[PDB]
Design a binder for this molecule. Structure first.
Ligand code: CL
Ligand code: CL
Ligand code: CL
Ligand code: CL
Ligand code: CL
Ligand code: CL
Ligand code: CL
Ligand code: CL
Lengths: 353, 354, 353, 354
């Protein structure tokens, strides 16, 4: 019925905000809108690893299933440039982890259930929102009502909330699709993340736990992605090996081949009156470890710090005059990503021993 | 009225490049103008050098004033990442040149005057345009008129033309300003382009001809850029040296300090009926050699190639069905830039001896 | 497998284009993406009536169910202005008809089945489209393929096609919702359409066949619309009667009360390479007879005329150089609507004897 | 630096109205300027007259030069629809006034100079603004600075301020241009405002003081507007008479013929942190008395009322939580205009005797 914070969306990013607030005393509601290696994985960078540790779920993730990488090798299909480095050259214990998204989500979901100030509502789609001066009024599809000082949108692109607040995102078609799959290679990957640049973007081999398995991200024209998805495994395996310059010898696909579109989503606003948005902007694709849930987790970390400060101070956590501090940080950061000025830093990041 | 195949609106570097590039095709072209170490310089990459060589102005540029660089060194203010390489390690004769924009423009402007199929009109601001099915009707402010099969917008962001065709750009504030200036350093730069990444973007030292002068690009918050522009030279020199990790020893600013905003400009369209746009999109700032006039020059090179082809085949160079090939190419390229997938290729680019 | 024209969407507007092309020789595909008085009705104006007659379905509509209105009365809740006129004062046999949308759709659907050059595909959602230079390639969700010289989007707002062609609409929230319902009144309506202007927009009583039934359009704040929808019938009936200045005596609601949002949708483009869009723009709400399916039917009429001309001439009906003629007409018209310069003309329109 | 409560950017009619309207509140206000029948006139409706009367400049306007109209007659070039009424039929003393914009502006400018809590700064172009949590920092081009609790943008479309706050307008080309001119007619206009609808929009005859002069608004295609602007007076006069169905007999143009574009400007936001915008949105053209400076004057009236209230209650007049009340009102009004639901009310509006 009455909460401080209502989080719309119960994905990794929304759960991370909810888990993050625990200890603050804020009453939080999250409203939802033995298995083999899942096909969707992320390259979890050093800043996300720090967040997950602060949240108390990183060790749960490492114990379930996680693949640590220690080296990086990047080159170009048509020209002579290369970047090659390892954790040791920079005083790191490791560069990052390759982790299944469902593993991360599960760890955060369990933690959320164990958090005394979090209420998870599982059938809880929104029907309406009224943006009152002093509080927000949320009506769920069952007609039940909920009041909040602050609404946090963590539901994908947040189209619905952004529409209600009249702060739309700008969508940008990146004209290429990404094919993903699990590939067994002849040579071991040696816990090195590898990527080759080419005319239709990138081809990355992300090392998994099995010394001879990688999960790939292969960007292609939408047409070529479709061809590669529908090809015989022999055609596919040969095309992949050539695209990867035979770097790990023969390749054998070992999973379904899935394709999804690549897009940018750019925000002129990350907040309004009693509204803050996380996880919905998307800028660069490369470096893979600087984006996806890593960007959303950075959104989450910064929102968490700001709300904890405001709440400490007895301030109204929903007022735009304070939320604009979070927004500014997010916009500055988005700009550095789009300007190409953030990629280098994320590429070379890692965790100290 | 005067009748041409192509009317290029804007006589800056990119528009002049298109006009010069078309020479030899037989297309009648009109260019309508709408309006010491020089402080505005570009890092001219290998693809731009190739174009300028095809156009016959590169040797002119080299003879006037140009600074060749052979090495690259990039690092991070807060971490241990670094990229460091030279031309020889990749079979190149050089990586790029630091060139004043005004030198490039003069070289193109002279070449344009020497081109038999180009008419340069100055001043020739536009008052109106009518987009007929078969030709375009251009009215200048003096009331003189011009017909063209195809209009090419090469006038900055092309706001006027884009408004008339109802295909606006999306503007994106990059929340940081760039300070530029000529800096004398204690240590010689050894013809290495250097750049450090930091919390407010980049700081690049672009080597000039004088062994101890660099032109910088220092991105900063708008407030800090203002403070650095207005600081005493001693405060500025000290802040810069620290920002650059003392990499070339003591720094002494030797010119005016100029500041300008960093922005993105994104296009859903690069063409319409009897209209093609060059030089108005802007994506990444880093790498510097991949952007600015380098992006505009690639727009130019691709438009030139497409129009020469269409003209050779007797096709109507103004029909959108044929211009969308050019558009598709620029959009695919825009996408790879914004997605972060093009920067690497441009960072490592260079010129082959042969 | 191979058609001239593929119409994406089989609603009233898409069917009207398909029926309209009949006689041209164009091969057309339409791909879909004893009952009481339906709650959704339109005020069909004189230009739509002419279209439907040219299409050969108007008499089918009149024989099924249609309500003819002969007079108009408009006034203001707070001030003294009024517009009052009838068909006779202007030499008309009638001003318009109130017709159920499902009746119109049914008539057009039957006509489409009887049209030799139309193929209706009922399970036929789109999966992909490739915009080739010479033709378009449409892949349906069953994986079957279809080629077309021209694609016509007639699927609501056409978000999907507009996204693929990168020509998005601009959405504008009109900040009010419309409540609709069937109302029995004490006084007969005398086949007069009535509307009162008020602080939250309009309240229109559209006369139905039964001399004492009207279908209403009541625009309200989203909150008040919700209140009115959920109110007891007594509260509702009293609120309505007051809002309508008791013009037809006591009111008794006789149907479900439905609410839907009011929005504008503005197009910078109505065509691209091998693509034309109908039925997706939306400008004014008042006059009701100038908008809704009336706007879409005018889109349809103009596209039909242009494609018939092009086809006569042996021209490539998909080339933007020709489609931009249709686009220009649509944009000029949209502008006159938004500028407030078209409403008067539609308000006073009617059919000559 | 100078310290004020409210800094109004733009010294046009709307900005001056806000400044004058606030007098009596105790708020310190700064206005920063950014830059015969006169040809630009407005149909000043009853709500605008009410505001101008509250501000104490309406009698000044009436004494200088103003044309009162008592009747309205609207019809259609191609059909038999018509609207025809007078003030008396509705209990009004008059419907509206046709007034030169320059007369309204001078009256407001003088009143502004007579207002003890207003400082007019001329010239005072902006160079920069910093949006601090507690106050705004304004830097003028001369380098002088100003702090304000609230910035009010009243400078045309407010592009600069809207860009800085990242809340851009949506621009919409209305595909037609308006030709304006002073026309002498054979028959007297009898203080009736007249308008005919036609295929390219409207043609309005706005009555002036002289019994046989009207100021017109003739919307046309851009091409036809150009042809009418450049035609001989005999061709123009004949075309106009036909377009007006000979309603006032023979027409004789008596001034320059000026053309300008018709456009819409739509706002998703009218406020942000320490920022409120007036006068920059534009929706319908018809009815004429409902739009133009009438829309800006309603923005002003509502902003004035809200700020006086906030100030009376000791609230921070710059916080978005309080400005969103004003915003909500302007957006609801914008919506009703674009939806076609406001025009009727404005068409029939007028002033009560008492
Ligand atoms: Cl942990
Ligand atoms: Cl050369
Ligand atoms: Cl932005
Ligand atoms: Cl075409
Ligand atoms: Cl019929
Ligand atoms: Cl007065
Ligand atoms: Cl437009
Ligand atoms: Cl606030």
């Amino acid at each position: 019925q009455s909460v401080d914070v209502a989080i719309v969306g119960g994905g990794m990013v929304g759960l991370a905000v909810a888990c993050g607030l625990q200890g603050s005393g804020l009453r939080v509601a999250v409203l939802e809108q033995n298995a083999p290696p899942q096909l969707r994985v992320s390259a979890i960078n050093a800043a996300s690893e720090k967040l997950l540790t602060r949240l108390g779920v990183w060790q749960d993730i490492l114990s379930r299933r996680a693949s640590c990488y220690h080296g990086m090798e990047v080159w170009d299909k048509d020209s002579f440039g290369h970047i090659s480095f390892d954790d040791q050259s920079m005083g790191y214990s490791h560069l990052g982890h390759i982790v299944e998204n469902s593993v991360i989500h599960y760890a955060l979901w369990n933690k959320a259930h164990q958090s005394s100030d979090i209420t998870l509502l599982a059938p809880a789609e929104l029907q309406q929102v009224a943006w009152g001066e002093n509080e927000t009024f949320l009506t769920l599809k069952d007609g039940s009502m909920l009041t909040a000082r602050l609404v946090i949108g963590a539901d994908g692109a947040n189209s619905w909330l952004r529409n209600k607040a009249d702060i739309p995102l700008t969508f940008w078609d990146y004209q290429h699709h990404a094919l993903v799959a699990t590939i067994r290679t002849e040579e071991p990957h040696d816990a090195v993340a590898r990527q080759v640049f080419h005319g239709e973007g990138i081809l990355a081999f992300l090392p998994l736990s099995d010394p001879h398995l990688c999960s790939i991200v292969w960007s292609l024209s939408p047409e070529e992605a479709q061809r590669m998805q529908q090809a015989s495994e022999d055609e596919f395996n040969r095309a992949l090996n050539i695209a990867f310059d035979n770097r790990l010898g023969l390749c054998k696909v070992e999973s379904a081949r899935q394709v999804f579109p690549l897009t940018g989503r750019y925000a002129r606003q990350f907040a309004s009156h009693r509204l803050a948005l996380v996880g919905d902007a998307a800028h660069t694709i490369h470096p893979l470890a600087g984006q996806g849930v890593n960007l959303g987790f950075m959104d989450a970390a910064e929102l968490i710090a700001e709300l904890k400060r405001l709440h400490r101070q007895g301030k109204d956590i929903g007022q735009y005059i304070y939320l604009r501090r979070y927004e500014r940080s997010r916009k500055h950061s988005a700009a550095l990503m789009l300007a190409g000025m953030q990629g280098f830093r994320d590429l070379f990041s890692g965790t100290n021993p």
